[PDB]
Structure 1
Amino acid sequence: SSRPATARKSSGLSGTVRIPGDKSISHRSFMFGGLASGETRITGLLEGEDVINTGKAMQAMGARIRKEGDTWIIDGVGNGGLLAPEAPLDFGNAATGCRLTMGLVGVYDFDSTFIGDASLTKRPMGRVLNPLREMGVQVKSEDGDRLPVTLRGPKTPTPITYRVPMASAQVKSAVLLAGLNTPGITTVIEPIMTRDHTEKMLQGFGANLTVETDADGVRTIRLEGRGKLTGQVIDVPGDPSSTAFPLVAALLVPGSDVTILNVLMNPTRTGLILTLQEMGADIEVINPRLAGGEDVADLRVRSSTLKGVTVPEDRAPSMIDEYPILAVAAAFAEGATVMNGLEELRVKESDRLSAVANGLKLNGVDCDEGETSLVVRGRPDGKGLGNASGAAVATHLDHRIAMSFLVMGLVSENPVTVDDATMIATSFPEFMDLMAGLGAKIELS
């Protein structure tokens, strides 16, 4: 069921720790490794529940996946070699696995059914199902294009040129993956850049995929379908979204000095760091280097005094999953922090804009929730913040709401309680141990 947890005011956080692997790249490592010809070897894989579910779905379609020592080894089926699954593919809490797999297997001439948990089942799939319908896929979904969904691909899919209407890397990714089993050229036009793990990894696996960027920033991504993919050696970098939690905690808890190692620094993932630096954060980027084909660095974070800033709508895609923890940082900053262009937060694991605003208010923070924006006014000394009565923040099955508010409790005058910590393991099973090791006081009921 649910397992509440309470975070208490802590003394300085201190230590050096390696952050778990990147979730986005980990999902794709299992997917591309399972699809490619031959063997793929992965080190640094995130072993959270979301990623394990993607792995099980790939096994259900013929990939052999196993862990030898600290390396995941995958024997792929080759492009065009996916086998019809016997039962529904259960993605649990993971929209990434679900949406990308819809594109990947929806274009195959067999039935595939997709199911998930109470959170995933409420999220919109129309954004990926519409382009698939244009490609010839037959779709059976629940009202509003929600799970459960059953797809059946045509004998020969139709390649399309699709302009993504919202800044979603998952929609871009689903169309490109569908293009892998479609004859001809599939083109995705992305007006605003989103995380590019699919493009970079498919090129690494040998796909004839090109990316052209116009001077105005619009990206035209072309993929030639039904081409060979070759197994690769993958070294997964640390998750910058998971890094955000100990990083913001170190900035807010006085007397802190925390170094996080091997953090992915791809600019489509670092909007929070840029934003915190503008607010006055002391974050040092150490030994920037190339590892596994990606930019990584170690980050040394020290306690800082923060000031509110205006966060523009165009930075949102580069930090979309970090708005919950940014809002918590803003609760302790001098002045107002204003964030717009947040419509996408309403369709995540939880409606994050509503969950964050309600959680902040429950914990004494002055904030204003707009249809697509949030304004937060802070109290630097944390006085009056938190909830002395022990009232619990509603997490709405969202791991990031649970983690963000637990970070808040390490700083607020009064403890912060979340109604459930059980979903944290979907993306960061190491969270409790990692934070405790740094000195955080978090009591699990």
Structure 2
Amino acid sequence: SSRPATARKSSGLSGTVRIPGDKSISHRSFMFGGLASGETRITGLLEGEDVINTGKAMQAMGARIRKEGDTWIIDGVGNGGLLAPEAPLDFGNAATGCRLTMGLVGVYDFDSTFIGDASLTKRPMGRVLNPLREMGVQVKSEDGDRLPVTLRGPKTPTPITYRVPMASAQVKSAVLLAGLNTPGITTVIEPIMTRDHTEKMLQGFGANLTVETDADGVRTIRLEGRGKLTGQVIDVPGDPSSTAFPLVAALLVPGSDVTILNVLMNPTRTGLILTLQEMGADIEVINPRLAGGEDVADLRVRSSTLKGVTVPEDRAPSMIDEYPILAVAAAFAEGATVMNGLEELRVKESDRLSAVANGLKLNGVDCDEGETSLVVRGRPDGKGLGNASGAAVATHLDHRIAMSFLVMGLVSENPVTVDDATMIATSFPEFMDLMAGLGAKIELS
């Protein structure tokens, strides 16, 4: 069932900690490692529930996965070598695993079924199912193109050129993965850049994949299908979405100085840091380096006084998952913060725009929720914020709503309670221990 947790006002947060691995890259390490020819070795893998579910799905299709010491070792089946799964592939809470695997296996000439939890089962799959239908995949789904879904690929898939209609890295990724088992050239056109882990990693595994960016920013991504993929050595960088929680906590809690090590700094993932810096945040980028083919750095974060800012719609893709924690930081900034271009927040683990606005109001914050926007006016000293009666924020099975509001309680005059902390382990099982080590006071019911 559910397990509520309550966060209480803290004295400064202090320490140096290594953040857990990046979820986006961890999911893809299991997928590409499972598909490629030969052996793939992975260090720094995120072992949250979401990633483990992807691992079990690849095993169900023939990949062998094991953990030796601190390294995950995978024996892949080779491109075109996936085997028909015996039972439905259960992705739990993870849309990333579900949507990417739909493209990967949907083009194979055997049936595959996809299921998930109460949250995933309400999310839209049409955005990935439509291009697959164009590629010749037969689709069976519930009303609204929701799970459960059963796919059956054609004997010979059809390559397509697909312009992604919304700024989704998962749709782009699903089409490219379907392209791996399709003869000919598959092309994805992305008018606004989204996280590029799929493109970079496929190139690293040997795929004939090119990316061309027009001066106007439009990206044309071409992949030649049915080519060989070769197992690789992968070093996963720290998760920038997970980093956001102790980072914002350190900015807000007076008397704080927290350093987070080995953080992924790919610009498609750093919109929150840029936004916080414009608000006056003291974030130091230390020893920027190249690790495992990605840009990483350590970040030293210190208590700062923040001021409201305008966050443009075009920055959304580079920080889509950090809007909840940004909304909490704004609740303590001087003045108003306005964020627009938020339509995508409504189809995540929870409708994040509605869950954030209701949670902020329950905890005394002045804010205005629009169809696709949010305005927050802060109270720097935190007085009158939080909930003295102990009323719980509804998380709607969304672990980022739970983590964002627990950070708020470390700063507000009154404690902040969330109705469920059990979903935090989907992407950040280390959260409670990591925050407690820095000095945070969070009581688990």
TM-score by length of 2: 1.00
**What CA deviation, in whole Å up to 9, does each residue of 1:75-104 have, x standing for no partner?**
000000000000000000000000000000
**What CA deviation, in whole Å up to 9, does each residue of 1:215-240 have, x standing for no partner?**
00000000000000000000000000
**What CA deviation, in whole Å up to 9, does each residue of 1:414-435 have, x standing for no partner?**
0000000000000000000000
SS of residue paired to 1:423:
helix
User: Matches of 1:269 and 1:377 in 2, distance apart?
Assistant: 26
User: Matches of 1:44 and 1:364 in 2, distance apart?
Assistant: 40
User: Matches of 1:176 and 1:12 in 2, distance apart?
Assistant: 46
User: Matches of 2:22 and 2:161 in 1, distance apart?
Assistant: 29
Q: Report the CA distance between 1:181 and its aligned residue.
A: 0.1
**What CA deviation, in whole Å up to 9, does each residue of 1:259-284 have, x standing for no partner?**
00000000000000000000000000
SS of residue paired to 2:422:
coil
**What CA deviation, in whole Å up to 9, does each residue of 1:118-152 have, x standing for no partner?**
00000000000000000000000000000000000
User: Matches of 1:308 and 1:425 in 2, distance apart?
Assistant: 32
Q: Report the CA distance between 1:62 and its aligned residue.
A: 0.2
Give the match for residue 434 of structure 1: 434
Give the match for residue 265 of structure 1: 265
User: Matches of 2:11 and 2:36 in 1, distance apart?
Assistant: 49
User: Matches of 2:424 and 2:377 in 1, distance apart?
Assistant: 27
User: Matches of 1:103 and 1:198 in 2, distance apart?
Assistant: 13
Give the match for residue 240 of structure 1: 240
SS of residue paired to 2:67:
strand
Q: Report the CA distance between 1:412 and its aligned residue.
A: 0.1
TM superposition outliers: structure 1 runs of 4+ over 3 Å:
none
User: Matches of 2:386 and 2:75 in 1, distance apart?
Assistant: 50
Q: Report the CA distance between 1:326 and its aligned residue.
A: 0.1
Give the match for residue 120 of structure 1: 120
**What CA deviation, in whole Å up to 9, does each residue of 1:153-184 have, x standing for no partner?**
00000000000000000000000000000000
Q: Report the CA distance between 1:316 and its aligned residue.
A: 0.2
**What CA deviation, in whole Å up to 9, does each residue of 1:389-426 have, x standing for no partner?**
00000000000000000000000000000000000000
**What CA deviation, in whole Å up to 9, does each residue of 1:7-31 have, x standing for no partner?**
0000000000000000000000000
User: Matches of 2:387 and 2:247 in 1, distance apart?
Assistant: 23
SS of residue paired to 2:375:
strand
User: Matches of 2:54 and 2:81 in 1, distance apart?
Assistant: 17
**What CA deviation, in whole Å up to 9, does each residue of 1:284-333 have, x standing for no partner?**
00000000000000000000000000000000000000000000000000
User: Matches of 1:427 and 1:353 in 2, distance apart?
Assistant: 20
**What CA deviation, in whole Å up to 9, does each residue of 1:174-205 have, x standing for no partner?**
00000000000000000000000000000000
Give the match for residue 163 of structure 1: 163
SS of residue paired to 2:66:
strand
User: Matches of 1:69 and 1:273 in 2, distance apart?
Assistant: 34
Q: Report the CA distance between 1:47 and its aligned residue.
A: 0.2
User: Matches of 2:172 and 2:291 in 1, distance apart?
Assistant: 25
1:352 aligns with 2:352: yes
Give the match for residue 192 of structure 2: 192
Q: Report the CA distance between 1:384 and its aligned residue.
A: 0.1
User: Matches of 1:63 and 1:377 in 2, distance apart?
Assistant: 51
User: Matches of 1:316 and 1:156 in 2, distance apart?
Assistant: 37
Q: Report the CA distance between 1:34 and its aligned residue.
A: 0.1
User: Matches of 1:81 and 1:96 in 2, distance apart?
Assistant: 22
User: Matches of 1:116 and 1:153 in 2, distance apart?
Assistant: 21
**What CA deviation, in whole Å up to 9, does each residue of 1:330-354 have, x standing for no partner?**
0000000000000000000000000
Give the match for residue 327 of structure 2: 327
User: Matches of 1:430 and 1:146 in 2, distance apart?
Assistant: 31
Percentage identity across paired residues of the two chains: 100
User: Matches of 1:170 and 1:332 in 2, distance apart?
Assistant: 33
SS of residue paired to 1:266:
coil
User: Matches of 1:111 and 1:443 in 2, distance apart?
Assistant: 46
TM-score by length of 1: 1.00
**What CA deviation, in whole Å up to 9, does each residue of 1:375-397 have, x standing for no partner?**
00000000000000000000000
SS of residue paired to 1:237:
coil
User: Matches of 1:311 and 1:74 in 2, distance apart?
Assistant: 42
User: Matches of 2:308 and 2:20 in 1, distance apart?
Assistant: 30
User: Matches of 1:318 and 1:184 in 2, distance apart?
Assistant: 31
Where structure 2 has 5 or more consecutive residues not aligned to the other structure, the ranges are none
User: Matches of 1:89 and 1:249 in 2, distance apart?
Assistant: 37
How many corresponding residue pairs?
A: 445
User: Matches of 2:81 and 2:93 in 1, distance apart?
Assistant: 27
Q: Report the CA distance between 1:208 and its aligned residue.
A: 0.1
SS of residue paired to 1:434:
helix
SS of residue paired to 1:262:
strand
User: Matches of 1:10 and 1:47 in 2, distance apart?
Assistant: 29
User: Matches of 1:310 and 1:291 in 2, distance apart?
Assistant: 33
SS of residue paired to 2:194:
coil
